[PDB]
Enzyme design. Structure first.
Site, PDB file in Angstrom:
ATOM      1  N   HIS B  28       0.816  -1.209   0.000  1.00 53.51           N
ATOM      2  CA  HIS B  28       0.000   0.000   0.000  1.00 53.51           C
ATOM      3  C   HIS B  28       0.853   1.263   0.000  1.00 53.51           C
ATOM      4  N   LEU B 116      -8.258  -3.404  11.295  1.00 51.54           N
ATOM      5  CA  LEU B 116      -8.596  -2.024  11.584  1.00 51.54           C
ATOM      6  C   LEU B 116      -9.290  -1.878  12.930  1.00 51.54           C
ATOM      7  N   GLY B 156     -10.931   3.864   7.982  1.00 49.35           N
ATOM      8  CA  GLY B 156     -11.245   2.491   8.348  1.00 49.35           C
ATOM      9  C   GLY B 156     -11.323   2.289   9.845  1.00 49.35           C
ATOM     10  N   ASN B 185      -8.152  11.619   4.314  1.00 45.32           N
ATOM     11  CA  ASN B 185      -7.932  11.723   2.872  1.00 45.32           C
ATOM     12  C   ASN B 185      -9.081  11.468   1.905  1.00 45.32           C
ATOM     13  N   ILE B 187     -10.705   8.711   1.047  1.00 42.10           N
ATOM     14  CA  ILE B 187     -10.666   7.494   0.249  1.00 42.10           C
ATOM     15  C   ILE B 187     -10.520   6.250   1.104  1.00 42.10           C
ATOM     16  N   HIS B 261      -4.504   3.104  -3.310  1.00 41.43           N
ATOM     17  CA  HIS B 261      -4.664   2.560  -1.969  1.00 41.43           C
ATOM     18  C   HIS B 261      -3.789   1.345  -1.709  1.00 41.43           C
ATOM     19  N   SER B 384     -21.409  -9.889  38.856  1.00 41.97           N
ATOM     20  CA  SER B 384     -21.717 -11.222  38.312  1.00 41.97           C
ATOM     21  C   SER B 384     -20.410 -11.980  38.181  1.00 41.97           C
ATOM     22  N   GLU B 416     -16.938  -4.999  25.433  1.00 38.15           N
ATOM     23  CA  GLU B 416     -16.058  -6.169  25.451  1.00 38.15           C
ATOM     24  C   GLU B 416     -14.855  -6.123  24.499  1.00 38.15           C
ATOM     25  N   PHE B 443     -19.840 -13.741  25.812  1.00 40.58           N
ATOM     26  CA  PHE B 443     -19.605 -12.445  25.228  1.00 40.58           C
ATOM     27  C   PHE B 443     -18.143 -12.096  24.972  1.00 40.58           C
ATOM     28  N   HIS B 467     -19.958 -17.558  33.943  1.00 39.95           N
ATOM     29  CA  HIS B 467     -21.180 -18.116  33.362  1.00 39.95           C
ATOM     30  C   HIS B 467     -20.845 -18.952  32.109  1.00 39.95           C
ATOM     31  N   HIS B 479     -27.399 -16.507  26.118  1.00 30.99           N
ATOM     32  CA  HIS B 479     -26.305 -16.343  27.084  1.00 30.99           C
ATOM     33  C   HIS B 479     -25.458 -17.551  27.404  1.00 30.99           C
ATOM     34  N   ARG B 526     -21.319 -20.501  37.283  1.00 27.86           N
ATOM     35  CA  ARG B 526     -22.223 -19.625  38.007  1.00 27.86           C
ATOM     36  C   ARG B 526     -22.595 -20.418  39.264  1.00 27.86           C
TER      37      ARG B 526
HETATM   38  C1  LIG Z   1     -23.109  -7.970  24.637  1.00 28.61           C
HETATM   39  C2  LIG Z   1     -23.625  -8.011  26.001  1.00 28.61           C
HETATM   40  N1  LIG Z   1     -22.881  -7.480  26.976  1.00 28.61           N
HETATM   41  C3  LIG Z   1     -23.309  -7.542  28.283  1.00 28.61           C
HETATM   42  C4  LIG Z   1     -24.489  -8.113  28.644  1.00 28.61           C
HETATM   43  C5  LIG Z   1     -24.868  -8.302  30.100  1.00 28.61           C
HETATM   44  N2  LIG Z   1     -25.914  -7.259  30.500  1.00 28.61           N
HETATM   45  C6  LIG Z   1     -27.248  -7.394  30.421  1.00 28.61           C
HETATM   46  S1  LIG Z   1     -28.094  -5.937  30.692  1.00 28.61           S
HETATM   47  C7  LIG Z   1     -26.615  -5.175  31.000  1.00 28.61           C
HETATM   48  C8  LIG Z   1     -26.551  -3.730  31.381  1.00 28.61           C
HETATM   49  C9  LIG Z   1     -27.860  -3.064  31.441  1.00 28.61           C
HETATM   50  O1  LIG Z   1     -27.674  -1.836  30.741  1.00 28.61           O
HETATM   51  P1  LIG Z   1     -28.914  -1.203  30.086  1.00 28.61           P
HETATM   52  O2  LIG Z   1     -29.075  -1.341  28.590  1.00 28.61           O
HETATM   53  O3  LIG Z   1     -28.703   0.137  30.625  1.00 28.61           O
HETATM   54  O4  LIG Z   1     -30.197  -1.560  30.989  1.00 28.61           O
HETATM   55  P2  LIG Z   1     -30.944  -1.284  32.387  1.00 28.61           P
HETATM   56  O5  LIG Z   1     -30.010  -1.562  33.514  1.00 28.61           O
HETATM   57  O6  LIG Z   1     -31.317   0.102  32.055  1.00 28.61           O
HETATM   58  O7  LIG Z   1     -32.102  -2.189  32.386  1.00 28.61           O
HETATM   59  C10 LIG Z   1     -25.570  -6.060  30.878  1.00 28.61           C
HETATM   60  C11 LIG Z   1     -24.158  -5.771  31.159  1.00 28.61           C
HETATM   61  C12 LIG Z   1     -25.263  -8.634  27.561  1.00 28.61           C
HETATM   62  N3  LIG Z   1     -26.419  -9.293  27.727  1.00 28.61           N
HETATM   63  N4  LIG Z   1     -24.767  -8.606  26.265  1.00 28.61           N
HETATM   64  C1  LIG Z   2     -11.129  -5.544  10.505  1.00 27.15           C
HETATM   65  C2  LIG Z   2     -10.696  -5.167   9.186  1.00 27.15           C
HETATM   66  N1  LIG Z   2     -11.565  -5.317   8.185  1.00 27.15           N
HETATM   67  C3  LIG Z   2     -11.226  -4.991   6.927  1.00 27.15           C
HETATM   68  C4  LIG Z   2      -9.972  -4.573   6.635  1.00 27.15           C
HETATM   69  C5  LIG Z   2      -9.524  -4.594   5.216  1.00 27.15           C
HETATM   70  N2  LIG Z   2      -8.972  -3.252   4.883  1.00 27.15           N
HETATM   71  C6  LIG Z   2      -7.728  -2.852   5.148  1.00 27.15           C
HETATM   72  S1  LIG Z   2      -7.465  -1.260   4.761  1.00 27.15           S
HETATM   73  C7  LIG Z   2      -9.078  -1.122   4.283  1.00 27.15           C
HETATM   74  C8  LIG Z   2      -9.780   0.193   4.448  1.00 27.15           C
HETATM   75  C9  LIG Z   2      -9.239   1.374   3.782  1.00 27.15           C
HETATM   76  O1  LIG Z   2      -8.785   1.960   4.996  1.00 27.15           O
HETATM   77  P1  LIG Z   2      -8.302   3.409   5.132  1.00 27.15           P
HETATM   78  O2  LIG Z   2      -7.943   3.319   6.560  1.00 27.15           O
HETATM   79  O3  LIG Z   2      -9.661   3.739   4.751  1.00 27.15           O
HETATM   80  O4  LIG Z   2      -7.254   3.661   3.991  1.00 27.15           O
HETATM   81  P2  LIG Z   2      -6.192   4.642   3.363  1.00 27.15           P
HETATM   82  O5  LIG Z   2      -6.493   6.072   3.241  1.00 27.15           O
HETATM   83  O6  LIG Z   2      -4.889   4.346   3.969  1.00 27.15           O
HETATM   84  O7  LIG Z   2      -6.378   3.976   2.103  1.00 27.15           O
HETATM   85  C10 LIG Z   2      -9.700  -2.314   4.316  1.00 27.15           C
HETATM   86  C11 LIG Z   2     -11.127  -2.500   3.994  1.00 27.15           C
HETATM   87  C12 LIG Z   2      -9.082  -4.429   7.755  1.00 27.15           C
HETATM   88  N3  LIG Z   2      -7.843  -4.070   7.650  1.00 27.15           N
HETATM   89  N4  LIG Z   2      -9.479  -4.757   9.007  1.00 27.15           N
HETATM   90  O1  LIG Z   3     -28.793  -8.408  32.894  1.00 24.30           O
HETATM   91  C1  LIG Z   3     -28.698  -9.083  33.933  1.00 24.30           C
HETATM   92  C2  LIG Z   3     -28.086 -10.477  33.920  1.00 24.30           C
HETATM   93  O2  LIG Z   3     -28.475 -11.216  32.746  1.00 24.30           O
HETATM   94  C3  LIG Z   3     -28.577 -11.209  35.165  1.00 24.30           C
HETATM   95  O3  LIG Z   3     -29.176 -10.282  36.094  1.00 24.30           O
HETATM   96  C4  LIG Z   3     -27.372 -11.836  35.842  1.00 24.30           C
HETATM   97  O4  LIG Z   3     -27.881 -12.602  36.931  1.00 24.30           O
HETATM   98  P1  LIG Z   3     -26.784 -13.240  37.683  1.00 24.30           P
HETATM   99  O5  LIG Z   3     -25.570 -12.213  37.787  1.00 24.30           O
HETATM  100  O6  LIG Z   3     -27.293 -13.625  39.152  1.00 24.30           O
HETATM  101  O7  LIG Z   3     -26.323 -14.561  36.906  1.00 24.30           O
HETATM  102  O1  LIG Z   4      -6.153  -3.174   2.087  1.00 22.04           O
HETATM  103  C1  LIG Z   4      -5.759  -3.793   1.099  1.00 22.04           C
HETATM  104  C2  LIG Z   4      -5.950  -5.305   0.979  1.00 22.04           C
HETATM  105  O2  LIG Z   4      -5.287  -5.954   2.075  1.00 22.04           O
HETATM  106  C3  LIG Z   4      -5.295  -5.726  -0.334  1.00 22.04           C
HETATM  107  O3  LIG Z   4      -5.149  -4.585  -1.189  1.00 22.04           O
HETATM  108  C4  LIG Z   4      -6.156  -6.762  -1.044  1.00 22.04           C
HETATM  109  O4  LIG Z   4      -5.431  -7.172  -2.203  1.00 22.04           O
HETATM  110  P1  LIG Z   4      -6.189  -8.173  -2.986  1.00 22.04           P
HETATM  111  O5  LIG Z   4      -7.724  -7.758  -3.061  1.00 22.04           O
HETATM  112  O6  LIG Z   4      -5.591  -8.275  -4.466  1.00 22.04           O
HETATM  113  O7  LIG Z   4      -6.055  -9.592  -2.293  1.00 22.04           O
HETATM  114 CA   LIG Z   5      -8.840   6.914   3.780  1.00 24.62          CA
END
Ligand SMILES: Cc1ncc(C[n+]2csc(CCOP(=O)(O)OP(=O)(O)O)c2C)c(N)n1
Ligand SMILES: Cc1ncc(C[n+]2csc(CCOP(=O)(O)OP(=O)(O)O)c2C)c(N)n1
Ligand SMILES: O=C[C@H](O)[C@H](O)COP(=O)(O)O
Ligand SMILES: O=C[C@H](O)[C@H](O)COP(=O)(O)O
Ligand SMILES: [Ca+2]
Ligand SMILES: [Ca+2]
Lengths: 678, 678
Positions: B28, B116, B156, B185, B187, B261, B384, B416, B443, B467, B479, B526
């Site tokens: 690149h 990225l 990206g 840039n 692009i 690119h 938890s 996460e 998760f 869990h 879960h 758990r």
């Molecule tokens: C990807 C993911 N991360 C974490 C959890 C665990 N979890 C369930 S609800 C919650 C937080 C609650 O936040 P929110 O959306 O504010 O709800 P509220 O307490 O307002 O009900 C978490 C950490 C989940 N289910 N999925």
């Molecule tokens: C997780 C992830 N998904 C996809 C790509 C594939 N990828 C690498 S560079 C690019 C994006 C172009 O990125 P940018 O940061 O936009 O580029 P620049 O100006 O340097 O071209 C893509 C799709 C990556 N590197 N990582």
């Molecule tokens: O969003 C809440 C969790 O899913 C749940 O309350 C967790 O219960 P526990 O921590 O007793 O397993």
């Molecule tokens: O970000 C760039 C890609 O990793 C690379 O250009 C992909 O090359 P290719 O599509 O010929 O495999």
């Molecule tokens: Ca760019």
């Protein structure tokens, strides 16, 4: 205009949801209690037929904050869906229709949620799909599609990167019919939001191109919530976020505390709540007749009526526009065009060597005109994935000049996880949408949260995962998959195709597209692979088949993708030394496993050592092979041919290993790995 | 103040990076050409010793947009690191020190990038670690720590959800020493940003609490770039984003096009570029002496001198503050306190049944004061996961009132993936940091992008994954993990511990903390599991051991986590029918596999049917077992005891299956699964 009945309805919801959490002695009472006023107001204003949860033009509602299910289940019962008080009384119980988190599978539940961040992103796909449907079938006089997509979300959903990806995209596409109501309650599990989430959500969302409205008293301002939703509906070219402030556990003795987030309220607390609300603290699961009567008149009957008008207008449409009507009728019935598989390409060993990645493109060019329900895209890798057909128009807002909403090619940006979830929403919308998205196989891992849900729910989405191995080359280990397939082949309900040549790619596509409840991932090569003598769509469709056969094989060589050819070559080397090797191809574990035992045992028999060959993790091969030649370490940055040699994947490298396997087992009686004791 | 030399230096960088991409005919060229002026300006003002890339107080630089590695390698050579022209001439070649994407493993490369979104998030962890080191060791008169953390990023990076999670947190933590320079840039691969990315990045960043400076002419305004960086250094309470506008492929005949690119420039285009910049279009890898002399003066010499003063100060410090100096010296030397493992808890079968989730907490409470380098946290699940020790002070800005930077407990929020990357950065910082973060096992999948990199680079981070199964209960399938461990056990270089009791949790922690190049995931239950008679730290530490033995077993039962006890019970039921079962425990595939063949074959021998027992995917078990009793389908929402029964995981249920395995194999000679032919 709200009255005492609206207020009676809101208490019935808060108490029903509380009764349901307490009876299970497991659950989340908080959000349901704070979001009840919003639900009442919103549902009352939604166009839906509780007697037909499949009506295509139904307003759709997603509960992104899934833990609040008790609220969703309460609404479903009260408004007349197939959910009884008995069902609510078995919430979280083994075998009930009322699981701890909403599942797609139930009527009235649009997608499965639990994992935060997934529902808001799904709703984005649902709105894109609506925009597409309307732009494709609506004709003047016939507005067949115009539904809204409503979502409820919490601080957790707004913290997960996936909702940011989707909201960024949502704003670029100008999805004005997408309305999200945010439960701004200041509490999450660890405690107060300020402890780790003190950003300006309102300002962040305006930066995406969204409209933000505010409701300061979500605990009681029914008319305010009503006004915010109404104004939201005027936002034609902007999706809307309504930051509605509430109090977690409203009414509870411990309201505003994170203690009311995920535990059933204490009994005495429940009694005081009921009393406060004018309910008998000693009775449970009580629904005032006046509430059933209310929802019947405000929702059920007008909805049924709307569904009826819609059906008449549609029948008229089929008269005026026979081609379009027939198509919409078919998509709605969920059938693929008759004998569409005829346009799928077939090859012979006479044709040129092509990268499975380019053979894929050819398929797309061939069936895109056959399947109007096919909507593709890429997460910024259109030219590497080769995922765009030449005559495609991009799905973009009309004001962009780059395309319009009737377009069938989506530019996802570098957002793999959101792409995964948006695809689920498009699939979940209906009208037989067949979404697929492309990325490099190694980065589908970035979307594991969404992919697992495609499997859990059964959304038949398609991932066009190119650059499947070290064949990737110079990009190196950060780009070369090792554990990817082993991972996805451990996940229930998902086809993980890795076609070897042209005929196998067509089988990968026919099975994936014909699938109604199983998503798919098609791992394609970057490099050129030849056309095999012995492959076919019919045989590859079985997931695994004997590519080359011999009488009394000394070894069975099982391979996938780019290694089938290499194995074919190794078998030629082996024939020279008088060793007979049968060569089996296994494009898909899932599909093959689905075959009847007698078929599988005909491909992988007893009394013959079986050695597998695949340049990825060997940990999953023990179910089909006795010995495995794979790569259990990260790759390398070098010319692909050199990287293969360096790892021993050379014809004679494979042949040597087959000879070592024959010697090792010479004299032992062998059992097919397929055979299980229990 | 810049001069002709600075301008000579920038041309050399642009041309060296281009020569490097052309030579490999892979790469690149675009970003390196547009980002060249920024690098020159930035590196020139960074405090670093090219002669000691490990100096703890060195300013750190992360290339988030890793594909631009040709720029990074150019700088490393020019400024004096261990990277020669010869190395540059083997870019992307098999075995070179110059792979297609930066790998932590090389001197001057702070973390591995390619995927990225990862570098920006890593840089956040590095600044959190700096802020913690300074608040812990700095004393008046002795500023041992004060380095800056610089990052280069593209569109990206800003599109991936992970960088949003991390930037939200970064703004909350008020990390003013973190300075990110954005290559604006217009692009990306698919084309122009407007096609899918037209959000207001600047406004989105202010929403996080960041400061945003702009540099309109990044192609040539050296002084402006220099001012932007200076101003950025004054923002002590705000991380800074500098939106610097540039032209991708600047100087190229195809500058501004996405064609520059990721493809080496056309030869004639390279010639004109060189000429344009006053270089001979016919020579390659040319470094004007004046360039070498310049960096030697402005960077190498000052840096060496800075490192020298730092060492004197430090020695004075160890005189003034013996305790702290000795600790810092030890952490710096990378050793754990002597005989720290003595604090680890041990148990006997007479102790009470505890969830391994609580046993974990107990370990943390016990070694937290032994290990000052231990910094924990949770992604909004502190209660938890049970990840907080009681005497902990949270890592927060002092102005919060909830803690301060000397705090050792981080509140990650529902993020996460960012947690995974932030942990890699804290680990990557040095001073023997031992980060660990908690979330539910299901998760950790959301973070697979970062986790894979912990393995690839060898960052020994720890994931406290609670869990671990259907033992989760009522929360349901969304879960309960099924494919998780099978996935991570297929990924090279990662311990995946699933301890059964108190003694096995202590071995999980001992092996995890003592690890210098291998990350870890500790899957905790758990539910309550009892103390096993036969377990121990010593044996558990070998990854796998014979928990209960018998002479001439009729079958070997291999189990992990919660299933060991069940197996122990199944064996009791089998003894009653006079069937002898040896019961083996396998808390870690990784650790066990690292043992000498003789040991492993003594645990899993020949001539005995081996059946595994684990309530998750069976797909990975064929390497140790003949038959497997597992769950190859999603879970259920029900009380945990009932979900286990429903799946057949009862003592007699396991016993029955052992009986069936014995009958099935009765008469056959069996070979241990460990034996390989090649
Ligand atoms: C990807 C993911 N991360 C974490 C959890 C665990 N979890 C369930 S609800 C919650 C937080 C609650 O936040 P929110 O959306 O504010 O709800 P509220 O307490 O307002 O009900 C978490 C950490 C989940 N289910 N999925
Ligand atoms: C997780 C992830 N998904 C996809 C790509 C594939 N990828 C690498 S560079 C690019 C994006 C172009 O990125 P940018 O940061 O936009 O580029 P620049 O100006 O340097 O071209 C893509 C799709 C990556 N590197 N990582
Ligand atoms: O969003 C809440 C969790 O899913 C749940 O309350 C967790 O219960 P526990 O921590 O007793 O397993
Ligand atoms: O970000 C760039 C890609 O990793 C690379 O250009 C992909 O090359 P290719 O599509 O010929 O495999
Ligand atoms: Ca760019
Ligand atoms: Ca909340």
């Amino acid at each position: 205009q709200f009255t005492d009945i609206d207020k009676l309805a809101v208490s019935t919801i808060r108490i029903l949801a509380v009764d349901t959490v307490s009876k299970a002695n497991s659950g989340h009472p908080g959000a349901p209690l704070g979001m009840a006023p919003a639900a009442h107001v919103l549902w009352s204003q939604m166009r839906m037929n509780p007697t037909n949860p499949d009506w295509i033009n139904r307003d759709r509602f997603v509960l992104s904050n899934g833990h609040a299910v008790a609220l969703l289940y309460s609404m479903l019962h009260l408004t007349g869906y197939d959910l009884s008080i008995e069902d609510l009384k078995q919430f979280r119980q083994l075998g009930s229709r009322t699981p701890g988190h909403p599942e797609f599978e139930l009527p009235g539940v649009e997608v499965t949620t639990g994992p935060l961040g997934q529902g808001i992103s799904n709703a984005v796909g649902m709105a894109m799909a609506q925009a597409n449907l309307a732009a494709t079938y609506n004709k003047p006089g016939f507005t067949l599609s115009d539904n809204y997509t409503y979502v409820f979300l919490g601080d957790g959903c707004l913290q997960e990167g996936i909702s940011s990806e989707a909201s960024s995209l949502a704003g670029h596409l100008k999805l004005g019919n997408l309305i999200a109501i945010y439960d701004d309650n200041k509490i999450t599990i660890d405690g107060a939001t300020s402890i780790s989430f003190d950003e300006d959500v309102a300002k962040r969302y305006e930066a995406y191109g969204w409209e933000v409205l505010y409701v300061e008293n979500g605990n009681e301002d029914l008319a305010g919530i009503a006004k915010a939703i109404a104004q939201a509906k005027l936002s034609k070219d902007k999706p809307t976020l309504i930051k509605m402030t509430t109090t977690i556990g409203y009414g509870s003795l411990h309201a505003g505390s994170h203690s009311v987030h995920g535990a059933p309220l204490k009994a005495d607390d429940v009694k005081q709540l009921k009393s406060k609300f004018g309910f008998n603290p000693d009775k449970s699961f009580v629904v005032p007749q006046e509430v059933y009567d209310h929802y019947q008149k405000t929702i059920l009957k007008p909805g049924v009526e709307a569904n009826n008008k819609w059906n008449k207008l549609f029948s008229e449409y089929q008269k005026k526009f026979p081609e379009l009507g027939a198509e919409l009728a078919r998509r709605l019935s969920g059938q693929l065009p008759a004998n569409w598989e005829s346009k799928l390409p077939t090859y012979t060993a006479k044709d040129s060597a092509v990268a499975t990645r380019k053979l894929s493109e050819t398929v797309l060019e061939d069936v895109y005109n056959q399947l109007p329900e096919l909507i593709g895209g890429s997460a910024d890798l259109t030219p590497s994935n080769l995922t765009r057909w030449k005559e495609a128009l991009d799905f973009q807002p009309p004001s962009s000049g780059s395309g319009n909403y009737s377009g069938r090619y989506i530019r996802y940006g570098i957002r793999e996880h959101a792409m995964g979830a948006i695809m689920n929403g498009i699939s979940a919308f209906g009208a037989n949408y067949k979404p697929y998205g492309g990325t490099f196989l190694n980065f589908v891992s970035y979307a594991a949260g969404a992919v697992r849900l495609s499997a859990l729910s059964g959304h038949p989405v398609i991932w066009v995962a190119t650059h499947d191995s070290i064949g990737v080359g110079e990009d190196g280990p950060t780009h070369q998959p090792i554990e990817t397939l082993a991972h996805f082949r451990s996940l229930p309900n998902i086809q993980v195709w890795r076609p070897a040549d042209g005929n196998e790619v067509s089988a990968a596509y026919k099975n994936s597209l014909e699938s109604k409840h199983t998503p798919s991932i098609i791992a394609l090569s970057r490099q050129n692979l030849p056309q095999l003598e012995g492959s076919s769509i019919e045989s590859a469709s079985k997931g695994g088949y004997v590519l080359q056969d011999v009488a009394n094989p000394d070894i069975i060589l099982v391979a996938t993708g780019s290694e089938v050819s290499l194995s074919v070559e190794a078998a030629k080397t082996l024939a020279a030394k008088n060793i007979k090797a049968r060569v089996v191809s296994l494009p898909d574990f899932f599909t093959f496993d689905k075959q009847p035992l007698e078929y599988r045992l005909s491909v992988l028999p007893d009394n013959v050592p079986i050695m597998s060959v695949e340049v990825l993790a060997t940990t999953c091969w023990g179910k089909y092979a006795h010995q495995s030649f794979g790569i259990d370490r990260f790759g390398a940055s070098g010319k692909a041919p050199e990287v293969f040699k360096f790892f021993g994947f050379t014809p004679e490298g494979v042949a040597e290993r087959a000879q070592k396997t024959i010697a090792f087992y010479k004299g032992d009686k062998l059992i097919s790995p397929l055979k299980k004791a229990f």
